[PDB]
Every structure is written in C-alpha cells, then in structure tokens.
C-alpha cells in the first residue's frame, strides 16, 4: 500500500500548498539575485535557497514517478513540463535552440502546473489555438506579403526600418500595434514616397481586423473549454449544450407521438 | 414607532436627492479649491461649505445607525464604507498604509453608494473579479517572470528602464500598454542587443491577450450580475437562466409520459 | 387626393435618391470650398451651387410640411432635425452655445436621416445609451476625482498638464487614451514624484476597463435594436426573444397536461 | 473518362499539396530577391525557380478550365482570381488602376484560395461585409465632415496637417487610431487655438466607437459564417438556429394537441 499512501500524499490539498510555497519561494530568491549591489554572502545565502529549493522539487518528481510509473507519470503534459523544468537545472553544459538556458525564474511557470484553477486557464487558451490556426495563417501570408513589398518599395530609401526582410516584418509588427505608425513611420516616408498611405492604411486596416478577430476567438473559445473544465472538475461532468438538451426533447416529443397516434 | 418613521425618510427618493445633491455640492467646493490664485476669504468660505456637507453627512449617517441599529447598519458594505469616508474626514491625525489622507475628493465616490443604479454597476464589477482571479494571477506570474528576465538580460546597458526589478515591472507594464515600445524602448535596446525582438515581441503578444482576455472576463460577467440585479430591484426576481427553463420543460414532458405509457 | 399624390412621391425610392444625390452634391461643393487656392469665379459658381442644393431642400421640406402636417411631420425626430439643418442656413445673424454656426458641412448628416439603413444604426446607439449612462456616470466620476487629485498633486511642479482642472482633465482623457501616458507625462513627473505610478498605473486599470465596458455595452446593445428595426422594416414586425419562444411551449404544454389529468 | 481522371487528380490532397509546396517555394524565392547584396548568377537562378513555380501554376489553371469547362471554372470566384493572378504574369506591358503590377508577391495570396480551412475564413470575411456597410458609410460620412471641418480651422495655421482635405482625411485616420494624437496634434493645435479639444476628443469619442462596432460586426458575422461553412464541408450541412429547433418543436406540440382535443 506503500504507493498508494505516497498518491494521498501527493494529491493532497497540504502537499500543493508546500510545494506552491517552495515555487513562490525559489521565485523571491531569483527576483532578489537580480540585485547588483547585493554582496558576496547574501548571494552565496540566496543561491544555497535556489539550491535547497530545486532539491525539493526533485524529491517531489521522484515521489511522483514511483507513486505512478515511469509510464504513467509521463502520460501528463503537466508532469513531462515539470520533469524538464527541474532536470534542465541539474545540467551544467546545455544546448535547445537559442543561445542559452540561463533563466530560472521559467521554474515560476510551475505555479501554472501545480494550481489547478490556473492549469486549466492555460489548458482552455493552448486547446483553443487549433481553431483559430487559419486566421493565425492568413495574418501570417498578410505579413509576409507586406514585408516583400515595403523591403522592395522602402529599402533603398528608408534601410534603417525596411533594409531587408527581416527589418520590415518589425517595423510591420509596429505599424500594426499602432506605435507612433504615422509621426515616426509613414509621415517620414511619405516626405519620399507620397502615396505611401495606399499601402499602410489598408495594410493597418486589414491587420488589427485579423489580429482582433485571431484574439477574440482565442478568448471566446478558451473561455468556454475553461468553463467546461472547471465544471467536470466540481461535479464530474460538464453541462450539455442547448442543441442536445433540444435533441433530447425531440426525442422525448416523438415517443409521446408514437403512443398516442395508433395505440392511445 | 420613531425609527419606522425615519426609515421611511431615509428610504425615500427626496432624501436620497437631498444627499446626492450634498455630494456635487461637496464635490464642486473641494474642485473650486484646486485653484491656487483664490483668495483667503473665497477659499475659507468654500472650506466651511465642505465642513457644513461634512456635518449633513454625519446627521444622515447617524440617523441610519439608529433607524437600523449598529449590527444592522454595519451588515452591509456600502453603509460600512460611507461611515469610514465620513468618519475619516473626522480624524486630524490618521494613519493607513501610503502617505496621509489628504484626499477628500474620495468623498465623491459616495455617488456609487447613494445612487442605486450606480451602486449595482460597481456591484456586478466586485463579483465578477473571482472568476477572472486565475486570469490575473496568469498575468501576474508572465509579468514577474519577465520583470526577473529583463533586469538580468538589460538592466546593465538600459539602466533607466531595467536597472531593478521595480523598473522592470513600469517599462514592460509601458511595453504591455504599447506606449513608445518600438520607438522609445525596443529600437534602443535592440542597437546594443540585436535580438531582443525574441523577448518584447512574444511579451506583447502573450500579455495583449491574457489582460484582453481579463477585461472581457470582467465585462461579460458584470454586465449579467448588474443585468441580474436591476431586474430583481424591479420586479423582485431575476430572469431564470435557459437551462433551468428546459430543464422544467423537461420534467412536464416526464410527467405527461408518465400519464399516457401505463394510465391512459 | 392631392396630399396623398404627394405623400407617394416623397416616400418613393426615386425621390429620395434625387435628395441623396443632392446631398452628396452640396457635400461635394463644401469639400471643393475648402481649397484656398481657387478663383474668384469658380468659388462663386460652388457658391451658387450650395444655394441651388439648399432651396431643393427648402421645397421638399415644405412638400413634407403640407403632405403630413405641421404636427404630424414634427412628431419625426429625423423630421425636425432636417428641419432645424436646412432652416439654421437661412439664418444670416444665429446664435447657439458655442462661437457661430459656420460648419454648412453638418448639412451632409442629412445622409443618416434620408436613407432608412442608416437612420437605423443612428437610431440602435442613440437607444442604446440610457442603458449605458450608469457606467458612463462611473466613469465621470472617476475622471472627476482624478482630475482633483491631479490638479492638488501636480499642478505647480507641472503647470502644463496639470496646472487647474481643465488642464488635468485633458491630460487624463490622453492618459486614459494610452497616447504617451510614459515617456510624455509619467517618467517625466516621476523624475519629480518617484511614486506617481501608484496614481497613474490604477488611473489607466480602471478607466480603460470602465470605457471598454461602456463602449461593448453600446455597441451589443445597438446592434440587437438596429437588427430588429431591420426585420420590422422589411417583414412589419421582429423575432421574438428565446424566453418568450419558451413561455408559449410552457403554456402549450399545460393545457395538453389538463386534456390528459382529468378528461382523457 | 480523360477529364473525370484528371478531376480525380486535381481534387486529391497530393495534387493540393503539391500546388501549395510550389507557392511556398515561388514566396520564398521572391523574398530571397528582396536582398540587394546577391550576385547576378544568384538572381538570375532565382529569377528561373520564379518561371518554373509561374510555368506549374500555368500548367494547373489549363488543367482545371479542361476538366470543369471554360463556364464551369470562371463559374468560381476562386478559379478567376487564380486566373488573373497567374494571367497577370504573362503581360509584359500591363495597365489596371494605380501606377505597375510590379508586385509578384501577391501570388502568396494563393495559398488562401488553395488551402480550403483559409479559403473560408476569408469567404466568412467578405460575406460578413454587406451587414456592415451601413456603419461603414456611417464612419465615412463622420470622416468627411470632420476632413472639411478640420481644413477651414486648422488648414491655414498647420497646413501640414490639415492644409487641405487629403491632409486632413490622413490626420483624422491617425488621430483615429489615438497615434499622437495629443502630444503630436492637438496640443501644438491648442497653443493656436485653445478649445480645439472640442472638436478632436469627440471625433476620437465617435470614430473609436463606431470603427469598433464596425470591427466587431466583422468578427461576429464572418466567426458564425466560417463556422457554418466548416460544417456543410464536414457533413454536408450546418446546425439549424435555435429559433429553427424551436418552430419544429412548437409544430410537433400543435401535431399532439390536434390528436388529444377531439379524436382522443
Ligand atoms: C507576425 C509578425 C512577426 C514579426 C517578427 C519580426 C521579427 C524580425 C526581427 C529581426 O529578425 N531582426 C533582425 C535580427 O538580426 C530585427 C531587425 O528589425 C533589426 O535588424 C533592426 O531593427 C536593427 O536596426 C536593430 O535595431
Ligand atoms: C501588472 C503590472 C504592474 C506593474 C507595476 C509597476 C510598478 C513599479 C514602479 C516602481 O516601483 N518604481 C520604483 C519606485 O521607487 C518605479 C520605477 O520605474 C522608477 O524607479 C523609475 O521609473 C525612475 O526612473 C523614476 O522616473
Ligand atoms: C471624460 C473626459 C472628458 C475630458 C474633457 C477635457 C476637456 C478639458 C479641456 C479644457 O477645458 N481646456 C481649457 C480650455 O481653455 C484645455 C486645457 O488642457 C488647456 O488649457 C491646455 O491644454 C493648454 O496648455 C492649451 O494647449
Ligand atoms: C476612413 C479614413 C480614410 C483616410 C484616408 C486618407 C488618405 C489621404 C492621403 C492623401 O491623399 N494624401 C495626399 C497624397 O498626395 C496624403 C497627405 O496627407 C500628404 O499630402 C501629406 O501627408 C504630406 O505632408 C506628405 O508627407
Ligand atoms: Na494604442
Ligand atoms: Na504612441
Ligand atoms: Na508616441
């Protein structure tokens, strides 16, 4: 029963609360070491808490996996996150994609995976990206397109903002979100080029229409799946949708039909 | 059957006018008295007026002590926090938790209190904020992650925007808001750091969306408390929600079933 | 039958696209107007051009007049507002509540009120602002503390933005709008106040909120009576709301459960 | 069976894969030749992976109007602007509307009339644009007034900004999208003309709102549309409205309650 007594442990209300503290705990010490002035044995004291703090989490994920099983403790998205999190700290010579694995503080992130209410904010907002794939795609082709043409149409002219590919998708990204567009963007250009408003006006307009339509559906969707987990969560079930509850009072309509036609 | 009587005075829409009216006028005097260039009399004249709206205040506040009795006044929210506005007002040396209570425009916000069409909107904005608790939180730990990231990353060469932790968490609440983020802050940055694109860029998009994501969370349920809360003011009910009224549909559909399958 | 010869010639399509195109003319005259550069001649043909548009507008009003009657066509809102625009022109000496009348382009609003589709969409957002005035109440009063406080705080180290009332009020509805509420106002006054953030950062949390709550409320809101009037426009009356589709199925429903109870 | 073979072909997932895999390549060798730093070997190779992609887009369009029929392929919009997109290519001296056709990377667009999940999110877009319109025209009517307003006050004093109606009609757009709008125009406006705030804060005030509604009727509409059409390609049909569910439901109630009164 060894195992089994260990799971009560590790699903416990107690258990959460401990390792939550030691998350918000190994946070402050991060946030503290940010501090320059700081000497050298209050640094030395805050890098021995990280140190004690990341010991916790490995007894913590060795707990779990032999509560669960290799197998089975990997089956979670939840507990393969917080594997790599804390094992990625016990490697001194790393390499990913980038340049190097030097901020801790992304062991923050495990107050997402270990608070459930905040699991399942993220869960509704990453199950919501699928849906919303085709407007991410068309807002990608618009600014792929536009970056092409202002590289063409501005890059000789203005290198600075539109000197080569890369240059125009961040100046783009700017016109986009709306950032000093005119004053420090298109009024510039348009001193050289000035018909340059025929491109970023309908460039802005189509943009924040795509952007705005790419977030309200993130918003709306996870909201929704959000909702349903927190329900299923409560009670074990969700509600149904009005389509079904009106599905079943057909059903129950035609039944009524069926004995009062012929043998009524 | 004196308490009844003045109940009925306090209740009354005339004496609800009277102290709304005693608010704007309290309101105007301590506006008139921003003005620096008054001179000692205009300004002690309009410094008695918001003694003698002050005194109206304290009349009223207790006259609804005694028409309600201290553990009946005291029950609800609203009363407590027109007691402590007035009462504070009342107190030369005070102490709270910032600097000192100079500020008696606070006073104004009796006008969410005393108008109930105005106290039902800020209502529905107060019990909409635990549902978006996990939301806030979310925006909470992407803002102190980042904070942590950009002191260690820019806090040396940028040490007005990032030089400590405080900095930080201002100029990526500036970068959130998207104030001057390319022109003022990201262009700088990226001449000593070309790629810090990779961190601003995916900061914008991950906090536009999660603080979107908070606001109409708050505005959607507000806005159907508030909806809830003028209809049960009115009529003394709210309209039941659809899934109670097919869930009902549904029982009168089991319960004619029930007479037309055996007896019938 | 005269009148009513009439009334089928004002209420006919052709009609009101001879108006129409007689309003985008008279818009059109006031746009070439503004052009500084033109002779003397050419402005007093555009001159004579606006008389012409305006006297068409004089006899049609006048053949609505006597077509519905004095009281009945200023029962129209649309109707005496077409009145007051075209009768305001032939005012040589006018007087207001602002400086003079000399904006002739406002005659163009004309458009709203002849074609019915975008009388409609006028008409949802005027009917849907008594049912945002609580929220656009709150938000006056939080711009009116704030402008208070501002002015007390600020005004003599930044006379500016700050110096009176007026001055504060600008700068918040700036603030409030996100239009360099950092690098132009706030570092600034941080460079004197280092905690101005604990005013500014909770200014601009709740007004945006407090604004996006009123402008989603008008625009729900308008939307639902704009598509409504639509469908009474085109079918003579609306669709029916969900809670009343479910009402007469609850009522069909109990009177088949006394025909079964009882006599059956 | 020679053109049922070859719809066979054209209609399979490999044959849409293929064509997307050649847009892709023909986007990426045009962004390729943004860079003005390569050799003439290198543009030149470029320039004939350009004729090669155009060369299979040529190949393919033949390939459809043979198999479906001259009619029965410009029967689609889709098919025509692939049509004119690829035609476009094949003229050396072109005319249309604006200056030269210069822009190749427009062929990118294809990728959304290709991939069928894009194809209708931009259907979903265009079908939502009609309901719209009349708040569209609403916004351009707003904007033109205020174009002329803006010229005849301000024009003489900033003709940079306002010192004609093209100036204007770009400022206002700016001013729309709150870009500087303060500390850029309209406090270097009132140092000229102190209460211009009077004519700028409500222009902001009713074009923010209405190009909000304008947005959000886009979203609205073109999310139910997309969704619909998402539907009828997955199982051949959509989910029928509430209000559609409800009519059959009342009509099956009307069906029992004739075969309970009088033959029961
Ligand atoms: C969905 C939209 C996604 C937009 C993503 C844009 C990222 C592109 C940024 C990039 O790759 N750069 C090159 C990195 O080497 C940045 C350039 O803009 C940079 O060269 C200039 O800004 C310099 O002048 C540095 O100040
Ligand atoms: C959810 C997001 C919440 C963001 C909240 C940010 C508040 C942090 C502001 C703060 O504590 N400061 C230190 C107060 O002492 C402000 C600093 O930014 C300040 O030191 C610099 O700006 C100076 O250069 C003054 O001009
Ligand atoms: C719901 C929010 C509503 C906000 C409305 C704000 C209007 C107040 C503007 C006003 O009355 N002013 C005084 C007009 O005399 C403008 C001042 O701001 C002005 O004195 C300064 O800006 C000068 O420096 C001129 O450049
Ligand atoms: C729904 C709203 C739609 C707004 C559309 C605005 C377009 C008008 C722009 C235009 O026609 N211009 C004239 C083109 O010749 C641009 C001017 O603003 C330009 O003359 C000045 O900006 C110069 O100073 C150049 O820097
Ligand atoms: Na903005
Ligand atoms: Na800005
Ligand atoms: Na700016």
Excluded at 91 to 114: D, W
Aim: glycine share 6%.
């Amino acid at each position: 029963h060894m195992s089994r007594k260990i799971r009560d442990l590790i699903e416990s209300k107690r258990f959460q609360n401990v390792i939550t503290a030691i998350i918000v705990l190994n946070g402050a010490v991060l946030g503290l070491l940010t501090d320059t002035t700081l000497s050298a044995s209050s640094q030395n004291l805050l890098e021995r808490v990280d140190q004690l703090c990341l010991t916790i989490f490995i007894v913590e994920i060795s707990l779990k996996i032999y509560a669960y099983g290799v197998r089975g403790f990997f089956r979670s998205g939840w507990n393969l996150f917080d594997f790599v999190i804390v094992a990625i700290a016990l490697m001194p010579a790393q390499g990913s994609l980038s340049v190097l694995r030097t901020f801790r503080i992304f062991r923050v992130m495990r107050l997402v995976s270990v608070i459930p209410t905040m699991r399942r904010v993220v869960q509704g907002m990453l199950l919501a990206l699928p849906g919303v794939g085709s407007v991410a795609a068309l807002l990608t082709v618009v600014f792929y397109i536009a970056a092409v043409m202002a590289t063409n149409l501005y890059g000789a002219t203005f290198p600075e903002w539109f000197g080569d590919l890369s240059k125009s998708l961040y100046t783009l990204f700017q016109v986009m979100t709306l950032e000093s567009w005119s004053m420090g963007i298109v009024r510039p250009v348009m001193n050289v080029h000035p018909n340059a408003w025929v491109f970023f006006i309908p460039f802005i307009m189509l943009t924040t229409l795509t952007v705005l339509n790419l977030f309200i559906g993130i918003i709306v969707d996870a909201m929704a799946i959000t909702k349903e987990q927190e329900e299923e969560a409560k009670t074990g079930h969700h509600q149904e949708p009005i389509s079904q509850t009106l599905l079943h009072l057909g059903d129950r309509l035609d039944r009524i039909e069926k004995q009062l036609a012929q043998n009524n």
